């Protein structure tokens with residue numbers, strides 16, 4: 001019960017791949033995505049985006065063992081990036097960084113096949 005299953009280890013690897021990805025300048029693109037702005041700070045976010053997601057929530061689902069496979073986790077990452085790209089303009093850094101991380105996620109999944 002203290003030993004992680006292979007699926008649990010794979011989930012953790014994918015999550016850390018996204019979280020730890022660094023660009024050529026050593027920036028971790030995940031930083032903005034770890035925790036959403038609060039409902040008090042950014043109400044127009046929550047009136048627009050119906051299914052809010054951040055990496056804190058993904059990590060929480062992962063620790064409660066709510067992900068029974070890798071695609072379930074990928075789906076929540078992709079919802080997060082889709083939301084970021086819906087709320088923020090295409091010229092924005094957050095939009096751009098979401099595209100890159102979505103690519104990093106898909107590469108990671110493919111490499112762990």
Ligand SMILES: O=C(/C=C/N1CCc2c[nH]nc2C1)c1ccccc1O
Pocket residue numbers: 032033034035036037041042053054055080083084085087088094
């Ligand atoms: O879009 C996200 C963040 C957007 N910001 C722009 C507006 C703003 C005001 N204060 N802080 C911010 C951050 C986001 C973050 C985490 C996960 C998913 C997201 O869509």
